[PDB]
Each structure stands twice: as C-alpha cells, then as structure tokens.
Design a protein around this ligand. Structure first.
Ligand SMILES: *C(=N)CNC(=O)[C@@H]1CN(S(=O)(=O)c2ccccc2Cl)C[C@H]1C(=O)N1CCOCC1
Length: 218
C-alpha cells in the first residue's frame, strides 16, 4: 500500500458541498463514494444527486429519514433497487424533504453492490481507500475541536466511538509524524481546510472513523 493517497490527484473527487439545515450528511457521503467509482470506471467526474437520495430513500424498507438523517449503506441499497441515481444537475440540492421525482431518463450512475469493511479495522479501511477509492464512513463529529478545526491532525481525546455524522475518506498520509485520514465533509468550503479535515489514523479508531465503513461497486 502507498504511504500517501489523495483521490483529488486522480480527479475522483467532486467539489465540496454544503448541506445547510438538512441532515443529509449520509446522502453527500454516499454520492461522494459513488462519484469516486463513476470516475474510475467511466472517466466521468459528475456530482451525483444527494437530493435524489433524500426524497426517494425515505421508506420503512431503507430506514433513511431524509433531512432527519440516514445511512450510506441504505442510500447504496436504494441505488441498487432503483436501478440508478440522477446527477445533481438534473435533480438539484434543496436542503428540504420533497416528494420523489426520480426520472431514469436523467440517470447518471448505477450501483450493483456495496462492500462493508470490518468494524474498527483501520488497516482494512487503508487498503480500501488505496485500492478501491473513496470510502463512506461514520464519525463522532459533535465536538467543538471538530467544528472549529482549521489545520494539522485532529486528535481530540474527548472524541468517542458514538458516531453521528457521515463523511468521505478520500485519502490518508502522515503530517508532522502523525498518521491521518483525509476527510471530505459536506459543511461547505468554509468548514475546516477548504471543506476538509485531517483526522487521527492508527490512534485506536479515533472518533469511530473505522467503525461503519462502506463503498459502492458499479
Ligand atoms: C448528518 N448530517 C446527520 N447524521 C446522520 O444522518 C447519521 C449518519 N449515521 S452514522 O451515525 O454515521 C452511522 C451509525 C451507525 C451505522 C452506520 C452509520 Cl453511517 C446515522 C445517521 C443518524 O443520525 N440517524 C439517526 C436518525 O435516524 C436515521 C439515522
């Protein structure tokens, strides 16, 4: 496995999005991972519709609750079941719960299956990020050191394994002798380091980052 990986280098990451008031982190994380796979397979870098997931996967079958929150694995299950997802250009982001208006004529991507990585296994998350592409993860993102992060490696001892926020791992590395995960957030460009955060890697599943990892397969 390489020492440093950053999928932005291979042009497999879209622009950082802003979820606003809607609790759609799980939908941005899911689309982020699928965008990665879409680029690696087709050569197309397209921002996929988080709104398509928010409106259409809000059922008993999935357990997604739109702006009330949801799961990356279930967003992937919706794409498999639906036979596709639209691009953000045809199904724009509203930051509200709306009635489903999916149109297969504007389908931009498909998904055949998703892979779940072993709970709390940082070594398996590292292999997947390096060899498969960006990975959807859950983190405890509830502490002020996370919200007000600006640089360096985020290594807060008040962080817990009690995850509450879906993000996207787009890489890893080591900064000033501290291993990190390169995380793409959905809180706009004005969060962290241009929408990104470097979070402690190999530090006992810090923030529960390796607890609930998944990535789709086209
Ligand atoms: C994001 N803006 C709001 N947070 C959520 O939507 C979270 C995302 N997850 S998670 O905590 O990352 C997670 C936990 C356990 C297994 C897998 C994952 Cl991805 C869950 C979701 C959430 O808070 N809820 C509570 C309300 O019902 C839907 C799920």
């Amino acid at each position: 496995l390489p020492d440093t990986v950053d999928w932005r280098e291979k042009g497999c990451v879209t622009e950082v999005k802003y979820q606003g008031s809607c609790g759609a982190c799980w939908a941005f994380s899911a689309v982020g991972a699928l965008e990665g796979q879409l680029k690696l397979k087709t050569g197309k870098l397209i921002s996929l519709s988080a709104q398509n997931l928010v409106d259409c996967s809000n059922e008993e079958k999935y357990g997604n609750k739109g702006c009330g929150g949801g799961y990356m694995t279930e967003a992937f299950q919706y794409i498999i079941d639906n036979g596709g997802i639209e691009a953000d250009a045809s199904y724009p982001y509203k930051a509200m719960d709306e009635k489903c208006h999916y149109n297969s004529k504007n389908r931009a991507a498909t998904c055949s299956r998703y892979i779940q990585l072993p709970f709390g296994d940082e070594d398996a998350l590292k292999e997947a990020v390096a060899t498969k592409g960006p990975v959807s993860v859950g983190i405890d993102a509830s502490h002020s050191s996370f919200f007000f992060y600006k640089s360096g490696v985020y290594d807060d001892p008040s962080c817990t394994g009690n995850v509450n926020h879906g993000v996207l791992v787009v890489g890893y590395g080591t900064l000033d002798g501290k291993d990190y995960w390169l995380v793409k957030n959905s809180w706009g460009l004005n969060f962290g380091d241009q929408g990104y955060i470097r979070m402690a890697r190999n530090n006992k599943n810090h923030c529960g980052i390796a607890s609930y990892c998944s990535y789709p397969e086209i």
